[PDB]
Design a binder for this molecule. Structure first.
Ligand SMILES: C#Cc1cc(Nc2ncnc3cc(OCCOC)c(OCCOC)cc23)ccc1C
Lengths: 124, 271
């Protein structure tokens, strides 16, 4: 379903990528953070954690994740934790492994972001 | 046999639902001739371990020995209850937050505000004598209740349990900067509570919600990493300004203990 939007409408895939960049910036800009590149800027898990707190209205204590991850393992832990926050918020367990996000799997990244977008479009 | 079976869920008369959110549901009800509030906890991946932990953690909350502490009356163990559930007495005026920020009938005067401050400081001083401290107890204006005679009481039902996500803070404006960043075991928890009291003093002085224009994630990030602080209000008495500044000391070790600010607040009373 998402993979048709990914593969066999490459100009729609670019529309999805443009819509997702608009959405994540509406929230992350409040922290003076800007996203220009979906293929790498969510791979270390930090922006996903910050985005979930912006979308669901909480702060994430800095001892709960790695704000500046120093290893592949810490990025995996960040993404895993962000996945837990998503499930805390009502989303079903995300499809990709946390390693898939850290490895900049473009498809795994937009699927996670688009499910965030589907749920939180109207959050101000 | 278990030492406590807890409160029988079947004996609860649920009357009217008050709220529902991330953590569960709040109901007004009745139990054994008491007007009560029932908190039904929503917990993902409930387990026997978490149930055992809930049942070990609840008895500590049944504190009947101090006028400025509101006890948990008891808890429903799950199983056999459908959900882990806490019961407390219904407090007619609601939370301090409600009385200060959502009071449509009257505005509490500053004599009453000083009494609220003294009440909270006395309850916190008592709680800080407990060994060990009640864990995961955050002080803010939503976790203080106002009883029928306008007595402020620290609510023991508003603790977070071990199985509740430590990674989601919903009232960061009252949390000490060090507690936004470090694990509780790496902080002096009593000193962190005094910061929260300083923010309560600010709230009582301004009658504003701290950082109301910012989201929770904005608040925590800016207080922790950018030095965002409440602005000391203009044109207040030097004595109040001095008290607020010492309770909000950047150095946790320099903040006073609650038992040292109790006599200070006593002298600011009308009586
Ligand atoms: C167990 C438990 C438990 C109880 C609370 N909250 C309260 N505790 C005691 N009394 C209350 C009275 C309230 O209403 C007073 C009327 O005010 C005009 C009230 O308002 C709620 C919103 O109502 C729309 C909340 C109360 C919070 C957290 C927990 C875990």
């Amino acid at each position: 379903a998402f993979d048709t939007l990914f593969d066999h409408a490459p100009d729609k895939l670019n529309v999805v990528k443009k819509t997702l960049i608009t959405f994540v910036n509406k929230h992350l800009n409040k922290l003076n953070l800007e996203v220009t590149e979906l293929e790498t800027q969510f791979a270390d898990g930090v922006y996903l954690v910050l985005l979930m707190g912006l979308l669901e209205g909480y702060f994430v204590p800095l001892h709960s994740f790695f704000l500046t991850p120093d290893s592949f393992e810490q990025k995996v832990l960040n993404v895993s934790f962000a996945f837990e926050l998503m499930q805390d918020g009502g989303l079903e367990k995300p499809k990709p492994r946390p390693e898939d996000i850290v490895n900049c799997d473009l498809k795994s990244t937009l699927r996670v972001l688009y499910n965030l977008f589907t749920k939180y479009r109207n959050v101000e | 046999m278990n030492k406590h079976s807890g409160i029988d869920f079947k004996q609860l008369n649920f009357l009217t639902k008050l709220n529902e959110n991330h953590s569960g549901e709040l109901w007004k009800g009745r139990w054994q001739g008491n007007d009560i509030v029932v908190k039904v906890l929503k917990v993902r991946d409930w387990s026997t371990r978490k149930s055992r932990d809930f049942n070990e953690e609840c008895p500590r909350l049944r504190i009947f020995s101090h006028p400025n502490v509101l006890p948990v009356l008891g808890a429903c163990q799950s199983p056999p209850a459908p959900h882990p559930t806490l019961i407390t007495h219904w407090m007619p005026y609601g939370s301090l937050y409600n009385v200060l920020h959502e009071g449509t009938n009257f505005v509490v005067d500053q004599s009453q505000a000083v009494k609220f401050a003294l009440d909270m400081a006395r309850g916190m001083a008592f709680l800080h004598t407990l060994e060990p401290l009640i864990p995961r107890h955050a002080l803010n204006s939503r976790s203080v209740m106002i009883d029928e005679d306008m007595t402020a009481r620290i609510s023991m039902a508003d603790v977070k349990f071990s199985f509740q996500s430590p990674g989601r803070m919903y009232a960061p404006a009252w949390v000490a900067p060090e507690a936004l960043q470090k694990k509780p075991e790496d902080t002096n928890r009593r000193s962190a509570d005094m910061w929260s009291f300083a923010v309560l003093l600010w709230e009582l002085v301004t009658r504003e919600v701290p950082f109301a224009d910012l989201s929770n994630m904005e608040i925590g990030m800016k207080v922790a990493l950018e030095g965002l602080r409440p602005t000391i209000p203009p044109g207040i008495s030097p004595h109040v300004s001095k008290l607020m500044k010492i309770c909000m000391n950047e150095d946790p070790a320099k903040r006073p203990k609650f038992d040292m600010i109790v006599p200070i607040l006593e002298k600011m009373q009308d009586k």
